[PDB]
Subunit: 331 residues, 4 copies
């Protein structure tokens, strides 16, 4: 299976390189010429195109990974529908809802897979907890807890065009909530503060947030987010149900424990992007390919992307109105 | 020693009365309970000097220096005001009252009489939560940003009790609101609450919920989230975490034993604490020694009437939030 | 049940005080006039004898706790036997195999209970582990691991007359191995070194040791000891068998965990004698009293005291001769 | 850097495949006596050369370095052929069960001036290596007591056990090496004992399936290794070092970080159980280091002499089992 990748930023590059551990990297494309040939050589790719559309039209290209900037997503995904190429699109699909509907509509017409880039679904720990809950191991779920904290904020100029913490960061946790609980959120309440850097405040965003979710069954969820955990990534999930509790913890660098007069000390948490995420991207990409090879529905759909976006809008509205907000209000 | 009288020989009054042997320079001098055989039996089991059917006779007994009010909640106000009129130092089990005006009167009268009013928030004296509070207070996690509390019981109380309890926010979350203030060292300004009926439809029919989440906004902008369940089948689950600018701190549940069994499926740890006495006995013992210390030493109580009042107000704000589906400021309830 | 306690050192005093939590502390005895008066008062005890033989002969004393120095044990225990008093004896019964055999002989003669003070069998975590093993939970036991480390060495003078690490420290581990595995050790190999304190070696003992056990079934055990673990007591037991593994860890002060840039940090280990052991001593004493009251064989017998002493001799011999030593040789 | 792999067994195949993930080296040649395996793997890996005769692989001038992953009785002759062809050589454990052969392997590679790297892959286990570096940095002060527990989920086949040299040469070998690696000093004396508790047949072959080995180090520090051929729960490979300033421990790895809680308490995920999930990363990192040593002209990270010492410790333990006493390393050198 021949794959073409568009956009060789940090994530496009991970996917491009991961291909040799899977299906074939057959084409790359990026608007920086330097990087383009550098990578054509480095990775040994058959074709390099500086214009995304050529790559989409090359008949040896069975599927496209769109990993370009966000403003670019709608156009390229719609272009793949045209060429009748299956398409994976990195997070987020779009921040504009009408664009999302078109991406969904157009790919549906072309009868081509649209896979949304929610990589955490393929984290081995989160996927295992997902399966156990779905298998009945904690009975009927009552309360979901998600904590998601990054080691540092992204750049301010980024934050300014990000759509805020609920669209840029909580998006992954909204998707995770639906995935793990296996039912829709109907209502959201959100609050957020500026506790890490005054500039995030001046940009109109928050760096610390809590979101409550009310699911169709009556089960409740709480997400909490922070842009700066000094100890590294903190991404934990818990589900509590009629028959017990299940929890997914962080991964540490090592299994080594030092004991001195103050007690035990474990190893540092995962802190760096690649050590934290490379396996989830690898496993996500293999699933996208598996889906294409078998003409399966995508493991993560355009719909999934749209619901996550809608929950983000409900939370932005809740934050401003100081009340919980039903998803209707926002569709 | 100090001579103590205990009113109410229910589950918790009995614990306090028995702990008095474990405490020194305090003795159990008198007990009172309205069930005559209960009173008779406990007088003889514990070798108590005086047993009174009428608690007012206990309070007026001149040998009694301080009183533990552990009778039904609807009697707390009357008994605590009666201690103030008798000039007796008073400890009152949670909750002080479900009626805000009664709590204001209780605080007024004891203050007038110049006697201690100590509110029985025993979890402040849990060795794990206390150590976490001290670490936070010390600067160990930097400036606090997010609080998390999970508090789940192995089983709901009986329906009869649920109907008169004021609902989950006044009867259960009350401890978590106090813990929040105690751990974070600042006031809550706003609350949002939701709740569902997921354990017993009867709780729902009685107008209450059995599962709830409560969001707190503190004065500093720090946020917190409490979640409660009336039934965790694995036993008590009471965890606290604080996340701040310099790290994270967490207090876990206690297990029965340090033993770990490993088989084909992996490691299996010991059961969680599950029964009331094994869970709570040490926190009650330590709470009571503190009350006695404050009394003997003339100190302000470690947990005051005002602490009882604030927890109740947060409960009323949450009850209003639940019904109005919106964030509620403490002021709208003050 | 009226108990007399002989010798009010660290442990005697703990037994004496626990009696309030249980049976009555009727009589106390200690050669130190001052310590005696000071304890009669503070514990409110009826009788106080500077002469232990008085206490044993008191007709109102039903059972005796012998918690004086090891060299007094044999005489007091035989004396309780003579006066028909059930007797509890603190670790160790004796360093002298002939005494032990006598203590056992005399007590059997007088038809009284002789309970050996191996309190660790009554540690809540070690007891739980023992019950799981006996229950079949890990199937047939194959390998036992015991690590036992104290936070500091006892004083030099004490070490000089202690009998060496195998008699003074490993004794508890020898006994725990027999208790946990439910069968006898037939052969032992030991080695030891001086890594903590030069003076311990100067007194002729070792401060670090390892002991291999061969059990009747062919199961193997390994004990390691150290006189000094700066982090607190380290007392772990692991049993590995045909159906799984079972482990008892040490106890921490608290369940609190602090996380910073270097990772998670837990609370300190138990470090002081009383927080570490008081609960085991209380449960041990309750069990002895229960044995007394119900006319039961003691939970921990003279013969238990004897086997642990024999295993200790087998280990001192292995250490000197650099080979495995069968119990038959000792 | 063009690599040739001899022996496409379990471990040879893992090395062959890992070359894909090592930028400075490619799999250029493979060789194995089974014509079917050779044709199969040639296709599967897309290898340029496949040689039925490992000597032709060795003499191929395009081969820069060789991984000898063939049966043990083959190692001596092929490593000596590498020295003759002036090819750097990595040899899978064990180097040889025969001491005179180990000496010739060492002598010949030294005379040819090529690296001989012994495949003790567990030194490259990320947990064990981190513990070794911590001990080396002084974080537990002076080491006093070493504990190693090493249990496999199941025994090898009996036909294999018969020619394995017995538990101390086939299994404990890894632990003897780890002991020297972690403690950074030599073992002067060993005591060993062992029993037959897993499978009667193992003992009929003259072996044991459960063993303990005490180590006395030059410093006076003491160590104890215990082994078992069958832990139902998976690999159990733990290391603990205790010393004057504290204790350090490397635990087993679990499949996931997920914990399930019910009436009886917490339940963690299964331990690693299959060969590949357990060992693949240690082999990847071991090979990378070998490639590094070769490229940079460095001494091997694990030398022939490392292999010889682990063998000598094996012999000392075998003697101790039989003589029921402690055995000095001198006795067997």
């Amino acid at each position: 299976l021949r794959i073409g990748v568009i956009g060789l930023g940090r994530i496009g590059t991970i996917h491009a390189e991961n291909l040799k551990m899977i299906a074939i990297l057959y084409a790359i494309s990026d608007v920086r010429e330097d990087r383009l040939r550098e990578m054509k050589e480095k990775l040994g790719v058959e074709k390099a195109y500086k214009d995304p559309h050529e790559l989409i039209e090359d008949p040896n290209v069975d599927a496209v990974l769109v990993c370009s900037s966000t403003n670019t997503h709608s156009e390229l995904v719609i272009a793949c529908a045209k060429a009748k190429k299956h398409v994976f699109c990195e997070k987020p699909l779009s921040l504009n809802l009408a664009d999302v509907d078109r991406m969904i509509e157009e790919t549906k017409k072309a009868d081509v897979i649209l896979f949304t880039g929610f990589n955490r679904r393929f984290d081995r720990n989160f996927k295992k907890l997902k399966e156990a809950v779905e298998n009945g191991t904690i009975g009927k779920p009552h309360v979901l807890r998600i904590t998601s904290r990054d080691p540092a904020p992204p750049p301010l100029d980024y934050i300014r065009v990000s759509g805020g913490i609920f669209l840029d960061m909580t998006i992954h946790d909204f998707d995770m909530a639906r995935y793990i609980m296996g039912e829709e959120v109907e209502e959201v309440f959100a609050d957020g503060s500026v506790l890490v850097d005054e500039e995030i405040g001046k940009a109109g965003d928050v760096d610390t947030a809590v979101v409550v979710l009310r699911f169709k069954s009556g089960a409740l969820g709480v997400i909490d987010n922070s842009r700066r955990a000094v100890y590294g990534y903190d991404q934990r999930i818990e589900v509590f149900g009629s028959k017990g509790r299940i929890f997914a913890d962080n991964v540490r660098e090592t299994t080594v424990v030092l004991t001195d007069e103050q007690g035990d000390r474990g190893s540092r948490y995962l802190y760096f992007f690649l050590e934290r995420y490379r396996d989830s991207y690898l496993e996500e990409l293999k699933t996208f390919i598996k889906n294409v090879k078998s003409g399966e529905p995508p493991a993560v759909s355009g719909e999934d992307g749209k619901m996550a976006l809608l929950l983000g809008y409900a939370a932005k509205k809740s934050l401003e109105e100081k009340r919980s907000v039903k998803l209707e209000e926002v569709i």
